[PDB]
């Protein structure tokens, strides 16, 4: 399953954090710092599948942004990497060439999208067309 989803910048400021397991604020901050430290050191030649405590992290870089999903050791890697890319594509389509400021100024809509695709630590919906239609219908209200 999925433990948490993070969208971060290079400077370390967390742009989005979704948690699917119980944690405290200090523990959450420590985990965020550890994830940032682990992801930043690695270069582009390295793999995207990095062990982290007793889980693993599937991460992708988009310019100055880092998208991270923390999953169990026995879970599939390529499927969740493509889930990351699908999520990024839908974010780009919905925000009309999304940028970092778009995520900053519309955190609640991003939370709605993340709930639409990921729920209870699993993949909920995969189609871009249906997700976009639902989001447009909600925005029409």
């Amino acid at each position: 399953m999925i433990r948490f989803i993070l969208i971060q910048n290079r400077a370390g400021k967390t742009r989005l954090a979704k948690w699917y397991m119980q944690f405290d604020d200090d523990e959450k901050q420590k985990l965020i710092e550890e994830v940032h430290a682990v992801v930043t050191v690695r270069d582009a030649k390295h793999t995207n599948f990095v062990e982290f405590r007793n889980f693993k992290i599937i991460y992708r870089r988009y310019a100055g942004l880092y998208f991270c999903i923390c999953v169990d050791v026995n879970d599939n890697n390529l499927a969740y990497l493509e889930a990351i890319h699908n999520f990024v594509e839908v974010l780009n389509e919905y925000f009309h060439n999304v940028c970092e400021l778009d995520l900053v100024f519309n955190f609640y809509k991003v939370y709605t999208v993340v709930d639409e695709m990921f729920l209870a630590g699993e993949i909920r919906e995969t189609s871009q067309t249906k997700v976009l239609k639902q989001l447009l219908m909600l925005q029409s209200l």
Binding site: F23, D26, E27, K30, L31, E51, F52, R53, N54
Partner: protein, 394 residues
């Protein structure tokens, strides 16, 4: 003459840098961040040489200042310049803190470019820099009276527990140490104790913690009055620069679906003059295990069907050694499915040192009314490191 200057935070991330000679690359920065800031057993010294490069370091609060050179520089020059520059910065914006560095990056860069030219500390009186710099800094009840003892005594015990989860290839997935200091003092009167200790302690997921007694006073040094009998002075949890006493290497070979071979090698990563005692290694075995043939040249090994594990007991072991246990397991083919999910190998030990690297520097006991001092008091100090959850994935 000064190769370059670096300013680091407590966590080990470089706050600022300024390199004056190209003969010093980022390898030097990494070497300082590893061998000095994150040293484990390195002997402390202000001037350290590594890879034919000399580093002079000065600590101010939780900030590190390093002057880097590759030549035979005048040693007193570097330290006098560091003191003068620290005094100048303190005069410009008061106390030296990481937040102040973040706010006055620009002024720091201007000062470094101004007072230090190519490594040559030109005339840099604080009064005369006002003309040359056009910027302005941004400033910002527990012990009864009437206690008597025939003799003065005290015991200190630093009790620590180390917890480790390690990957099969040797990557340290997680590690943290929980410790406490226990003081048992038979002292006559109302003594005052100054406790001095080194920098290994800063003042679910394990996070750094430090909690003192009610009698502790902070102003480095810790001043207190010991209550009679035994009491817990301070407790703490640390996560950085842990010293791991042991390293376990498992090698598991699955011969088809009927046999199995497990070879475990344990190594002792501490000094040869220290001795760990009561070592026990728990090696799991699959549920459908008909029997096991185990051979080891150190300690004794036995199989437990009720617990379904191999217990390997070593009475004691010295530092910088190695040991190996090899077991051949025969499996009855009941079900050709439900692969044996390997649980981690467990370790228990006791080491006569603090794995977190803590070391007590001094303890001065002064009595105002009576006449005795720390020379009269008899002092014992014991370190007891122990294993908590010590697991290596197999």
């Amino acid at each position: 003459m000064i190769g370059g200057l670096f300013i680091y935070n407590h966590k080990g991330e470089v706050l600022i840098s300024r390199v004056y000679r190209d003969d010093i690359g980022r390898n030097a920065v990494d070497a300082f961040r590893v061998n000095v800031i994150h040293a484990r057993q390195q002997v402390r010294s202000p001037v350290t040489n590594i890879a034919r490069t000399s580093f002079f370091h000065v600590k101010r609060s939780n900030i590190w200042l390093a002057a880097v050179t590759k030549q035979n520089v005048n040693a007193a020059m570097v330290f006098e310049f560091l003191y003068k520059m620290c005094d100048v910065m303190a005069a410009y914006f008061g106390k030296i803190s990481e937040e102040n560095i973040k706010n006055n990056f620009v002024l720091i860069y201007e000062l470094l470019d101004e007072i230090l030219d190519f490594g040559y500390p030109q005339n840099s009186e604080t009064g005369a820099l006002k003309t040359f710099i056009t910027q302005q800094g941004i400033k910002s009840g527990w012990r009864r009276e009437g206690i008597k003892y025939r003799r003065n005594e005290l015991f200190l015990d630093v009790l620590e527990s180390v917890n480790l989860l390690m990957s099969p290839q040797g990557q340290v997935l997680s590690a943290h140490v929980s410790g406490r200091v226990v003081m048992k003092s038979y002292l006559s009167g109302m003594p005052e104790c100054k406790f001095g200790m080194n920098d290994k302690i800063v003042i679910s997921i394990a996070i750094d913690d430090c909690t003192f007694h009610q009698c502790v006073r902070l102003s480095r040094s810790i001043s207190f009055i010991p209550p009679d009998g035994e009491f817990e002075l301070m407790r703490y949890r640390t996560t950085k620069d842990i010293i791991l006493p042991f390293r376990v290497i498992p090698l598991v070979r699955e011969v088809g679906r009927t046999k199995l071979e497990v070879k475990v090698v344990i190594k002792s990563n501490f000094k040869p003059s220290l001795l760990a005692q009561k070592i026990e290694v728990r090696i799991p075995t699959p549920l459908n295990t008909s029997g096991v043939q185990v051979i080891c040249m150190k300690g004794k090994a036995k199989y437990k069907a009720s617990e379904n594990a191999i217990v390997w007991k070593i009475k004691r072991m010295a530092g910088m050694k190695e040991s190996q246990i090899s077991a051949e397991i025969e499996l009855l083919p009941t079900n050709d499915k439900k692969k044996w999910a390997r649980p981690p190998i467990s370790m228990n030990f006791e080491v006569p040192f603090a794995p977190s690297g803590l070391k007590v520097r001094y303890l001065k006991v002064f009595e105002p009314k009576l006449n005795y001092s720390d020379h009269d008091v008899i002092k014992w100090v014991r370190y007891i490191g122990r294993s908590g959850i010590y697991e290596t994935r197999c």
